[PDB]
């Protein structure tokens, strides 16, 4: 089981996403179902450790945003081209 803590992005775009990855974070999005897509932000080192397991990309994950748990699955991940880092993750609502 993986429990991830997230925060709703106050601002979006290229400059913001570069600036989060400056401040050791990275954006993600939760989508799927009838609910609207949710633009979140994660801590990079936690999720980078959690993703080393295939359990991460197989099991159902709990994302806590505003104290609201969301069971999702890792649909797709954008990785850094030559560094062991994460750019962005798509989460599908289970």
């Amino acid at each position: 089981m993986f429990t991830i803590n997230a925060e709703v992005r106050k601002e979006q775009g290229k400059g913001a996403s570069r600036r989060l990855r400056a401040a050791n974070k990275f954006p993600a999005i939760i989508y799927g179902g009838k609910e609207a897509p949710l633009a979140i932000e994660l801590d990079h080192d936690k999720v980078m450790n959690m993703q080393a397991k295939a359990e991460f990309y197989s099991e159902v994950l709990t994302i806590v945003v505003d104290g609201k748990e969301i069971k999702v699955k890792a649909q797709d991940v954008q990785r850094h081209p030559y560094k062991p880092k994460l750019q962005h993750i798509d989460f599908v609502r289970a």
Binding site: A54, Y57, A74, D76, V77, R79, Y82
Partner: peptide, 9 residues
Amino acid sequence: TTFVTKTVM
């Protein structure tokens, strides 16, 4: 260069 492995997804 660097060394890489097969990542799941």
